[PDB]
Each structure stands twice: as structure tokens, then as C-alpha cells.
């Protein structure tokens, strides 16, 4: 009944289209939740999409001024993958930060809400409020904003608390049926570890995070699900994945330390490893969240100074808006497949013809077959959408 | 299959956020039922929210003048905790008063409707109309407006009939699979008993009610399920929980009798006991239903003249509107947890910029871990919503 992700990793030559929600296009006619910070997670049967909704729909008077991320009204919305966030959507907890697991028996939700300084993280398992934690650093307590990973019933959640421009305490929480059985403080070469995209690299969990201080490369957190021992490093590839970043001709990594290059304000993203090569995805624009491309860097997980790209794909066209992206793993028949989701942000703070901010999602999964080209933007026309 | 609630009570140091529905905020754009008098109850798998809907949606010409509580159109709506009362909501009985149990096998609904003088209470079990009762005092027959409790299949419902502000008759009905097997008249020191919040204090049921006659303290009804013997008293803590109530500096209790202080009206609320201490919740205000705070009074279940709080929480801010609140118990892995819900009322009878009255709900559950601070109001802006 429990899920141990024991199978190998599927052979990946690229990613194929899997899902699209068309949330903003449907919001023009119809009642659709205003969301942001989405992700995807699958129970052993099918896959679900999650988002942090601002407590209102888009054709709503309350949809104005929704660019803020921490309000008493944001909740965690869950549907099946594909069903748009209509008014029948079940909102499963009060949260302005969130993460979600399925251990093979029941869903686990980690939900952070409350005052910025003093905040509360509720751990909900099988429809019960099983546990709760308070801020340790008395700052904005926050978590992965994507799925967490369970192995043999022990789930792992990475939670950060503190300032970027300051001392940030990151902890890894080991949860069993909603109860926190252990808590390990982060240790290693990674100074900052925010918004981690974790995947089960059996026998452990590997997370690729964002650095918001002094880094355009991504941190790596290796959690031993068993000994509860944490290792930290940085993604070693010379083509770094954060944004803002440098221009590829002029870029670099350190494989241990931040690169100290355009390291000011990252974007959540993902990466994983195929042998020595690294499969990664990033925005096509190097400064704004415009476009989204995935590719493979040869010897990028074990050699800085590698800039051999391959199997490049353009998921979202370079002139179209993207945002947070993340990884989730799906148990196949004989191996473990890796999929990713991209959040396509639309609205205020970058397009001043509307008063709201919302997102759509586009989901791709790895494939051992062949694939073509394309581009799957959000498609909403904000110059007409109702005002 | 039956549910006995045999486990101990969970260690409670406070309450953590569990759910929020954002009904009024979504009603500005959407099809949400005009409700009031909500509650929460859980089958052994998940939790459900119930409400008494006025037979219309907020943006509907019929939302006009919905401050009345007894109309032929109010029905009992049941969704899954979190799903807002959209137009797909199943309305499970005709009722302007209601209560609901789950005995581990099927749902029980007690629904009161009819003319105020001569009224009928239908008892519906497993989707059948199993039983029915008429008013005994030929007055407004009414019930708990929250969940009832079943132990060994025998469920218990407290029903009052009689004077709004005078002596009234109260009975405790013992139901088995929808059939009323016994009926005990209330006996003890509690004079007026209404809108009870009951919880399984194994081996029996303990209910904390409201005194609408001569008290600002809450009555207590101890029902022993096996011998159908009823005991009545008052909540003994010096910090009384009904509203209207007197200042904390000058409030009193009797532990047997009404305090005769600001006891004219009241509000439905809850309280339970942790050893000698009492965990309770009330509105921060003592004359209006504004705000909501929960705390613990030390030796408050055994000693009057005790005004020693601890573990105070502010669930709803002092300047924001609250209403009915109630308790419901959730069976954990090794103990029984206590949760409460607060009804956030918005509209006519106070805010005269709209013609309707509706409510939202906010749900908290007890925790043995730590928690922070916050405030989770309704959040609707009625200056911009349709009248």
C-alpha cells in the first residue's frame, strides 16, 4: 500500500505534451478561481493539480489587487489534472504557502498561513489536522510550492524561514502519517534553499531549489530518507537555470558555491540528472519570465565548464509569459518517469491592462519515443477580457 | 462499523487553521447559496460542511430580505469541507432547524420545518425518512444547529420547545438507525437550554448550550447514553462565554445556576474540559458578535471566581464580524481531537449597504504542536458587491 519508488528511472530523450488547463481563456466567460503558484502531484491512479487561490474568481470585484502573496484568504485548491478551477473546486486548507504528498495511502498537505513574523504550518493527513509547527526564525515561513516525496511512509518537506538578505534557517521535516517524527537542520554548501523541486532518487530524495542571494545556479539538497542526513551543493552545469542570469556566452557555475552572478532574484525551477548529464528547464529570456525551454547539458551534473546543449525543446515561445515551473515523478510499469509543469502568469505587475494577476498551467512528461516541435502559450487576450 | 469514540482525548495546547470557504467573496461573481447557521461533521473518512440555505443564491432577486429564520424554503445543504455552496450542492431535507450525525454506517439528519406554532421534526437515516415528531409545547421547535453524537449506534439529539425568553421544555431523543427509541425530559439545574454544542465525552455526551433567559454563562448537559440519565449544570468558569455578557473585570458564574448578568439574549458557542481547566471560545466583544477568541481558563470547569486565562488565540479580529460557533470531534489515530467552526455573518440587521444576509465559515482544529498568530476574517467588501 505504501509507495517506495523502488523502480529505476525511465529513459528520457525529451518531453511530450501532457496537459493544459486554459484557465485564463475560460475565465473571460465563466467563473474561474484566481490562482497562482500551482503544481501537480499524482496518487497511484491519476494526477491532480493544486494551486493557491486568492479567495475570489476572476470576473469579480475582489479580483483587483491580487498581486500580493500573503493574505488571510488564500487557500489550497485541488482538482484532477485537467479540470479547470471552477466554483466546484475543493479548497483543502488555509494556506499562502503549500506542499503536497501522496504516500500510497492518503494525501498529505503542508499549509502555511498566518502573520508574516509569527506563522503556522499545519500538517493535514487523510482529512485530519495531525500536526502543527510555528516559525522558528520569526520570519516568513515558506515551503516548496510543489510536491513533496514519501518513501515507505516517511514523507519529506523542505521549509525555509528567514530573510534572503540575512540568515535563513532551512529545515527538512520527516513526517509519518501527518505526524512530524524528525527535523534536520540544513547542512552543506548551499547557503539559500527556497522553493525546492524534489523528486525520489531512490534511496533518497533529491531537490533542486532556487538561490535568491549571490546565485544564478540552482542549489541541490540530497536527503537520505533513512539516516536523515542532508547534503548540499549546487547544480554543476555551466548553463545556469535561474533568472535573472547571465548570457550563456558569459556564464558559469561552481558546483559547490554560488557563482555570484546576477544572483539577486531567482525563479522557481527544476533539474534532474541522467547519469552525468543534466536535464533542465529555464525561461528563454535571461532577465524576465518570458518563454520556457528545456534541454540536456552533457556532463552537466559533474562538470562545471560544460556547455554542450542537446535535445532542446521550446515549451513556451520566447515572447510569451511563463513563471514558476516544477517537477513531479510518475511511477510507470517498469521505471519512474519525470514530468514538469510550467506556470504561465498573466496580469498586473507586467501587463497593466488588467487589475488582476492569475496563472494557467502547462504539463509535459518525459518520453522514450520521438517528439516534434510546438509552442503552447496561455493564449488569453487581455485587451478584450472583461473589465 | 459502528463508531464508539472509545479513545482518549487528544492533548490540546491550542488550535490550528483547518479550513475556510470564502463564500461571500466568491458570491460577488458566481452562484453561491444564501446560507446561515452552518456546522461541520465528519464521517470516518473526511469532513462535511452543512448549512441552512434560504432557497436562493446571493445575486438573485430572492436574496432580498433574507434575515428571517423560518421560511418554507430553507433547506439543509451538505458539501464536503472546503467546497463552497455552489449550485451543485445537494440539499438533503426541508428544514429551518437542523442537526446531523454519522454513526459509522450512515448519515442521520434531524430536520425541523412547518408552521412556528405546529412544527414537524423529520428523522432521516441512510436516505430514508425513518421517523417524525410533532411539537410538544406548540411553539418554535428547534434543535442544536450543530452535529449530534452517536455511540454504539445510539445517537442523541437535544431539542427545545417553548418560550424564547421563559421556561421552555427540552428533551433528549435517543435514535437508533433513524428510529426514536427513547425520549428523556431534561432534568437538573439548567433552566434555559438552546443550540447545544455536543461532543462525545466517552462514555457519554457532553453538551454546552446557550442560556437565552437569565444567564451569561453556558449550560452543561451530561447525557449518559447507556442509562438515558440527564444531568444539568452551568459552565463554572468566571470568564463567561455568552454574548451579551458583562466586563471580564465584573463577570460571575454560579457553577449551578444562571448568573443573572446580561442574560437577555445570547449566541451559540462551545466549550469543553481538559482535566479541571476549560477550553472555550467567545466573541472578543461583549455586546456585539464582533471578533472571536479562544483560550483556556485554569480550573475553570470546577471553580468559579477563576479568571486565569492561558493559550489565548485570536481567530477573528476584534473589528470583524463573527456569529454562531460550535464544536465537532474527529477520531484520530490514538485519541479524539476537538475542532471548532466559526460562522462569519455578513449583511442586513447591521451592515445596511446590502439587502441580504449570508455567512462564511472558518474551521480550526486542536493541536499538540505549536502555532502562531493570525486573523482570518470573511474579507468580503460589501461596498462593491451587488445589493
Amino acid at each position, epitope marked *: 500500500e505504501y509507495r517506495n519508488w523502488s523502480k529505476p528511472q525511465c529513459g528520457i530523450t525529451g518531453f511530450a505534451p501532457f496537459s493544459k488547463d486554459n484557465s485564463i481563456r475560460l475565465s473571460a466567460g465563466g467563473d474561474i478561481w484566481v490562482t497562482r503558484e500551482p503544481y501537480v502531484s499524482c496518487d497511484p491512479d491519476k494526477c491532480y493539480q493544486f494551486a493557491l487561490g486568492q479567495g475570489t474568481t476572476l470576473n469579480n470585484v475582489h479580483s483587483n489587487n491580487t498581486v*500580493r*502573496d*500573503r493574505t488571510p484568504y488564500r487557500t489550497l485548491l485541488m482538482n484532477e489534472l485537467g479540470v479547470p478551477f471552477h466554483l466546484g473546486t475543493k479548497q483543502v486548507c488555509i494556506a499562502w504557502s503549500s506542499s503536497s504528498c501522496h504516500d500510497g495511502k492518503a494525501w498529505l498537505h503542508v499549509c502555511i498561513t498566518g*502573520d508574516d513574523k509569527n506563522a503556522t504550518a499545519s500538517f493535514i493527513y487523510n482529512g485530519r489536522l495531525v500536526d502543527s509547527v510555528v516559525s522558528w526564525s520569526k520570519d*516568513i515561513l515558506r515551503t516548496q510550492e510543489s510536491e513533496c516525496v514519501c518513501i515507505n511512509g516517511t514523507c519529506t518537506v523542505v521549509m525555509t524561514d528567514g530573510s534572503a*538578505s540575512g540568515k535563513a534557517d532551512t529545515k527538512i521535516l520527516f513526517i509519518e502519517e501527518g505526524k512530524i517524527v524528525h527535523t534536520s537542520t540544513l547542512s552543506g554548501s548551499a547557503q539559500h534553499v527556497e522553493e525546492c523541486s524534489c523528486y525520489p532518487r531512490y534511496p533518497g530524495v533529491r531537490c533542486v531549489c532556487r538561490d535568491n542571494w549571490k546565485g544564478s545556479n540552482r542549489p541541490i539538497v540530497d536527503i537520505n530518507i533513512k539516516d536523515h542526513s542532508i547534503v548540499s551543493s549546487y547544480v554543476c552545469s555551466g548553463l545556469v537555470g535561474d533568472t535573472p542570469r547571465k548570457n550563456d556566452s558569459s556564464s558559469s557555475s561552481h558546483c559547490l558555491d554560488p557563482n555570484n552572478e546576477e544572483g*539577486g532574484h531567482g525563479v522557481k525551477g527544476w533539474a534532474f540528472d541522467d547519469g552525468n548529464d543534466v536535464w533542465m528547464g529555464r525561461t528563454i529570456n535571461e532577465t524576465s519570465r518570458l518563454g520556457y525551454e528545456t534541454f540536456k547539458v552533457i556532463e552537466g551534473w559533474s562538470n562545471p565548464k560544460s556547455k554542450l546543449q542537446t535535445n532542446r525543446q521550446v515549451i513556451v515561445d520566447r515572447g510569451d509569459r511563463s513563471g514558476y515551473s516544477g517537477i513531479f515523478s510518475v511511477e510507470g510499469k517498469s521505471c519512474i518517469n519525470r514530468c514538469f509543469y510550467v506556470e504561465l502568469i498573466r496580469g*498586473r505587475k507586467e501587463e497593466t491592462e488588467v487589475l488582476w494577476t492569475s496563472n494557467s498551467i502547462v504539463v509535459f512528461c518525459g518520453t522514450s519515443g520521438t517528439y516534434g516541435t510546438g509552442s503552447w502559450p496561455d493564449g488569453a487576450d487581455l485587451n478584450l477580457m472583461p473589465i | 462499523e459502528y463508531r464508539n469514540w472509545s479513545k482518549p482525548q487528544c492533548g490540546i495546547t491550542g488550535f490550528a487553521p483547518f479550513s475556510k470557504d470564502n463564500s461571500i467573496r466568491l458570491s460577488a461573481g458566481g452562484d453561491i447559496w444564501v446560507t446561515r447557521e452552518p456546522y461541520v461533521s465528519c464521517d470516518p473518512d473526511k469532513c462535511y460542511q452543512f448549512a441552512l440555505g434560504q432557497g436562493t443564491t446571493l445575486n438573485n432577486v430572492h436574496s432580498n430580505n433574507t434575515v428571517r429564520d423560518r421560511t418554507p424554503y430553507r433547506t439543509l445543504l451538505m458539501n464536503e469541507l472546503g467546497v463552497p455552496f455552489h449550485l451543485g450542492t445537494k440539499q438533503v431535507c426541508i428544514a429551518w432547524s437542523s442537526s446531523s450525525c454519522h454513526d459509522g454506517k450512515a448519515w442521520l439528519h434531524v430536520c425541523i420545518t412547518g408552521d412556528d406554532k405546529n412544527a414537524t421534526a423529520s428523522f432521516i437515516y441512510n436516505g430514508r425518512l425513518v421517523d417524525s415528531v410533532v411539537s410538544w409545547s406548540k411553539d418554535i421547535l428547534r434543535t442544536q444547529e450543530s452535529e449530534c453524537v452517536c455511540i454504539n449506534g445510539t445517537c442523541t439529539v437535544v431539542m427545545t420547545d417553548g418560550s424564547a425568553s421563559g421556561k421552555a421544555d427540552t428533551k433528549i431523543l435517543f435514535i437508533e438507525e433513524g428510529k426514536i427509541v427513547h425520549t428523556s425530559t431534561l432534568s437538573g439545574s439548567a433552566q434555559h437550554v438552546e443550540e447545544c454544542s455536543c461532543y462525545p465525552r466517552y462514555p457519554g455526551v457532553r453538551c454546552v448550550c446557550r442560556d437565552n433567559w437569565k444567564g451569561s454563562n453556558r449550560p452543561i448537559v451530561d447525557i449518559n447514553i447507556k442509562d438515558h440519565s440527564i444531568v444539568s449544570s452551568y459552565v463554572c468558569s468566571g470568564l463567561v462565554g455568552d454574548t451579551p455578557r458583562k466586563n471580564d473585570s465584573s463577570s460571575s458564574s454560579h457553577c449551578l445556576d444562571p448568573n443573572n448578568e446580561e442574560g437577555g439574549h445570547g449566541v451559540k458557542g462551545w466549550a469543553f474540559d481538559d482535566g479541571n481547566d476549560v477550553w472555550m471560545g467567545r466573541t472578543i466583544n461583549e455586546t456585539s458578535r464582533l471578533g472571536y477568541e479562544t483560550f483556556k481558563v485554569i480550573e475553570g470547569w470546577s471553580n468559579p471566581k477563576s479568571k486565569l486565562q492561558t493559550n489565548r488565540q485570536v481567530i477573528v479580529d476584534r473589528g470583524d464580524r463573527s456569529g454562531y460557533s460550535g464544536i465537532f470531534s474527529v477520531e484520530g489515530k490514538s485519541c479524539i481531537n476537538r475542532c471548532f467552526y466559526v460562522e462569519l455573518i455578513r449583511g442586513r440587521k447591521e451592515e445596511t449597504e446590502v439587502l441580504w444576509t449570508s455567512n462564511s465559515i472558518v474551521v480550526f482544529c486542536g493541536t499538540s504542536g505549536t502555532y502562531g498568530t493570525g486573523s482570518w476574517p470573511d474579507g468580503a467588501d460589501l461596498n462593491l458587491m451587488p445589493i
Partner: antibody, heavy 123, light 107 residues
Framework: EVQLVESGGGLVEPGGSLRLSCAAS????????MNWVRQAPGKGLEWISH????????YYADSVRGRFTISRDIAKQSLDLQMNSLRAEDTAVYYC????????????????WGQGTTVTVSS | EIVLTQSPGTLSLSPGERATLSCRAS???????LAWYQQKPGQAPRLLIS???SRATGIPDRFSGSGSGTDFTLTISGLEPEDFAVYYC????????FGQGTKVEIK
């Protein structure tokens, strides 16, 4: 039209006390962190005090620490600053301001400022 | 004391052109915490830029600040009659700190 409004400044002899009040509607003291920032006549803006969203964590600049307190009272959702043991160095145009810090975007900025209250400390 | 020096004492330029104002920090400050305000003498300081690149609502896309590391710059594509005002850096933190003040003048 209407937003954050501050008042309560006046001429006091040095060594006196004063209380400054900023009150605001919609641009609430419930949602944003608030900051008092002053400007000496023809000098650079100097931030003096910061109050969190819950009105618990309080920070003061070195210049005014120990003589000034920024506090909030529920009255009309408003915040005040109590100044005691004033000096001639405190003549300024005091400002109240609101800020937020996004965990994904960073400092929002003091988007909304008051009109300004003129304080001249002299004998 | 992370002292933000706004490097141009004054741009001192002729109207209808680009204006490039600077801002240098003592130590490496993350670009997230930095903002740019326009104080026209006599009125409240008006926000222009947040997070060192993000523009404020109601502010035209003409103003485009950038920078990183220790140094940041504010660039104005075209000066117009209103643009002539003092421009301040500001950095979130304990404590906040403003800049000494950069003016832009006619001719």
C-alpha cells in the same frame, strides 16, 4: 482623494513631547507594514521607525531610538508615534508610509505615503 | 551601515533625453530589497521602481531601473517637464536607508 492621513504635529519647546497620528481607510493598518520616515528641511529622507503587520515587532533608527515610540490603537484602524524628550534636531516633515515584502518579488516599496506633517521644535 | 551613494551629484542635463542615475552600495546587497522614488519638492516621495527592475503601477514604461551586486542604475528614456525632481534609492532591512539625493535639472 482619501488614503493614509497623518496629523498632530505642532510647535513645542525642545525637551517636550508630542503625539503624531496617521489614520487610513482601505490602505489599512491590518494588511501592510507601516513606517515613519522624516525629512529635515532640505535634507535627505531619513527612515526612523518600522512597525510590522501585527504591530508586534518594532524597529527604530539610531537617531530617535529611546525617545520615540511608534504604536497602533484599534481606534479607526490607526497608528501613532509618541515622541518624548524632543530636541532641535527633530524639526522635519514627518511621513507615515506602507510597505509589503513579497516572498517571490521582494520589496513592494512604500507605494502610499501620507501628505506630511510639519514639526518645528523651537523656543 | 550599508551606505547607498547615489553617484551622479546631479545629471545636470538638457530636456528630452536619457537620464542615467546611479546608486552604489557599501557591501553586496541583494537587488530584491532596493527601490527608487521620485520626490518632487513639496510633495510626498512617489515610488518609481521596486526590486531594482520592477516598475510601479501608474508609472509609464519609460522608467527602467536595473543593476546588481553593489551597483544599480536608473535610466529614463525621455525627460519631460515633470521628470525634473529628486530621486532616491532605498533599501529594505534593519535599518532602512535612503540615498543622499540625486537631482535632475533643466538645460
Amino acid at each position: 482623494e482619501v488614503q493614509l492621513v497623518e496629523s498632530g504635529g505642532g510647535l513645542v519647546e525642545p525637551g517636550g513631547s508630542l503625539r503624531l497620528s496617521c489614520a487610513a481607510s482601505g490602505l489599512t493598518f491590518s494588511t501592510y507594514e507601516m513606517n515613519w520616515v522624516r525629512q529635515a528641511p532640505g535634507k535627505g529622507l531619513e527612515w526612523i521607525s518600522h512597525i510590522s503587520s501585527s504591530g508586534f515587532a518594532i524597529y527604530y533608527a539610531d537617531s530617535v531610538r529611546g525617545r520615540f515610540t511608534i504604536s497602533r490603537d484599534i481606534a479607526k484602524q490607526s497608528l501613532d508615534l509618541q515622541m518624548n524628550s524632543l530636541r532641535a534636531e527633530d524639526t522635519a516633515v514627518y511621513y507615515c508610509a506602507r510597505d509589503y515584502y513579497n516572498r517571490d518579488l521582494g520589496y513592494s516599496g512604500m507605494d502610499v505615503w501620507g501628505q506630511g506633517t510639519t514639526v518645528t521644535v523651537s523656543s | 551601515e550599508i551606505v547607498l551613494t547615489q553617484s551622479p551629484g546631479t545629471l545636470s542635463l538638457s530636456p528630452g533625453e536619457r537620464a542615467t542615475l546611479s546608486c552604489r552600495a557599501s557591501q553586496y546587497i541583494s537587488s530584491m530589497n532596493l527601490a527608487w522614488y521620485q520626490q518632487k519638492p513639496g510633495q510626498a516621495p512617489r515610488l518609481l521602481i521596486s526590486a531594482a527592475s520592477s516598475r510601479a503601477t501608474g508609472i509609464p514604461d519609460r522608467f527602467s531601473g536595473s543593476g546588481s551586486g553593489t551597483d544599480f542604475t536608473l535610466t529614463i528614456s525621455g525627460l519631460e517637464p515633470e521628470d525634473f525632481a529628486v530621486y532616491y534609492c532605498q533599501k529594505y532591512g534593519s535599518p532602512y536607508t535612503f540615498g543622499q539625493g540625486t537631482k535632475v535639472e533643466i538645460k
